Design a protein around this ligand. Structure first.
Ligand SMILES: [Zn+2]
Ligand SMILES: [Zn+2]
Lengths: 95, 73, 120, 72, 54
RNA sequence: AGGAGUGGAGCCUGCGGCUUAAUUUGACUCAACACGGGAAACCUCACCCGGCCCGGACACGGACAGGAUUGACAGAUUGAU
């Protein structure tokens, strides 16, 4: 997968901390990441790479994939995309 | 001297292909099976099968001496 | 030789939308819905085998999977080989089979000769 | 034990290798000591790969790598 | 292998529909928009609200 | 005690046998045999003949920006841009 795919999958992971999928290899493009043309196979195999390291936490369902973010996975996105900690994701917004 | 040592180290091994595998050979991939193992046969029971003891005498067995009954002679 | 009252020589230059009015309804509807992208490239292969063939010699056998190819009258004389699931079987196109499918000339099965019945 | 090695692996279905000469820009460029830029091969007139991305020059044609444009 | 593998037209037919929880293709209940297997419907029937009255 | 029958006939569909490159398969008294919601053109599809792909996470060593895989017109090769 190219850089504008593997980067752009990691961008919305830091935004809210969760990612869903379909377990649909053959899907043309992921519906959350329109205007990028990233297939569902790309985000599926990217999170398969991230789960074995321990940055995300997997849960399955009827058909869909679910992924949360661990504490040591926030820092792995913090340095891969170079963000300062003065901004926060959706952890400390309400209450 | 080392080529026989190359025969020696494999004889510590080709012997040891016999004490864990009885006669595990590789089947021939190139030549047909009715050609590589033409000469053999399959026995229904290794002890209670018939076998003609003089079916294929080699030419060396025309150079040895026989007995009519060894114990009684 | 003719076919619906017109000889093969007018069929060689019979146009695309006028030859369709001589066929039966499956083949007429098939020419109405169009010949697809991998069926234009077969006729081009048979042209490429025809005009490089020697003038006293039939062209070489050509291998296909296209069992749905209608035998057009511009496809007579060619040696096509249509598959049977196992082998490519050699087919020589005669002018009397110009409304059939290509896939009814490689039989797909061994015609059955029975043995002795076992325990029924 | 409880297996046979069987020596029956046949992967001999050879793939390609990317033959690159050492710094193929020297195949691309040729500069004399006065400073002339002699682009020995054609430049593709496409919108995506114009003025920087060079074509191929085969035995009978020009050939691109981005949009695979072809000439005679 | 781009105009290929997921190329074949799956626009109808038995193998363009699958169960929505099994992803299995056989014994399928398309009525009322259920789209479940006949086995996975029977597990989740009382959750959907299909009660067995008679 | 009866009624409709089935078993006879043609055909439709299951199941054995034979055949086959393959004729995928489970189930064999009631408690297998229009059952697997099983009415398969492709898909379903397991089976047969041929071919492409990795969709082999991650950890370690090498190749390593005198590069690692990738993609691609034409020609031959091919069922096949
Ligand atoms: Zn370009
Ligand atoms: Zn289901």
């Amino acid at each position: 997968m190219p850089k504008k795919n593997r980067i752009a999958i990691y961008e919305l992971l830091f935004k809210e901390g969760v990612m869903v999928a379909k377990k649909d290899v053959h899907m043309p493009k992921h519906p959350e990441l329109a205007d990028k043309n990233v297939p569902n196979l790309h985000v599926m195999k990217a999170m398969q790479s991230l789960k074995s390291r321990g940055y995300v936490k997997e849960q399955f369902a009827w058909r869909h994939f679910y992924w949360y973010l661990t504490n040591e996975g926030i820092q792995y996105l913090r340095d891969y995309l170079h963000l300062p900690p003065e901004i926060v994701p959706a952890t400390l917004r309400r209450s | 001297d080392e080529e026989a040592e190359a025969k020696m180290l494999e004889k510590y091994k080709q012997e040891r292909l016999e004490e864990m595998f009885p006669d595990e050979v590789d089947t021939p991939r190139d030549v047909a099976a009715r050609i590589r193992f033409q000469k053999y046969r399959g026995l229904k029971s290794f002890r209670t099968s018939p076998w003609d003891p003089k079916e294929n005498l080699p030419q060396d067995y025309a150079r040895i001496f026989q007995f009519q009954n060894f114990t009684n002679t | 030789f003719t076919y619906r009252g017109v000889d093969l020589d007018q069929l060689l230059d019979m146009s695309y939308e006028q030859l369709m009015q001589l066929y039966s309804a499956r083949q007429r509807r098939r020419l109405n819905r169009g010949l697809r992208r991998k069926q234009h490239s077969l006729l081009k292969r048979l042209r490429k085998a025809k005009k490089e063939a020697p003038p006293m010699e039939k062209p070489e056998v050509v291998k296909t999977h296209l069992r749905d190819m209608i035998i057009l009258p511009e496809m007579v004389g060619s040696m096509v080989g249509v598959y049977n699931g196992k082998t490519f079987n050699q087919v020589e196109i005669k002018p009397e089979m110009i409304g059939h499918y290509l896939g009814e000339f490689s039989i797909t099965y061994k015609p059955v000769k029975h043995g002795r019945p076992g325990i029924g | 034990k409880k297996r046979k090695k069987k020596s029956c692996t046949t992967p001999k279905k050879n793939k390609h290798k990317r033959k690159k000469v050492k710094l193929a820009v020297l195949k691309y460029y040729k500069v004399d000591e006065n400073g002339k830029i002699s682009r020995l091969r054609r430049e593709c007139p496409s919108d995506e790969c114009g003025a920087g991305v060079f074509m191929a020059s085969h035995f009978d044609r020009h050939y691109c790598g981005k949009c695979c444009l072809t000439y005679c | 292998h781009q105009q290929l593998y997921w190329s074949h037209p799956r626009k109808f037919g038995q193998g363009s529909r699958s169960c929505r929880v099994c992803s299995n293709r056989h014994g399928l209940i398309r009525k009322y928009g259920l789209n479940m297997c006949r086995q996975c419907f029977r597990q989740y029937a009382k959750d959907i609200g299909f009660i067995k009255l008679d």
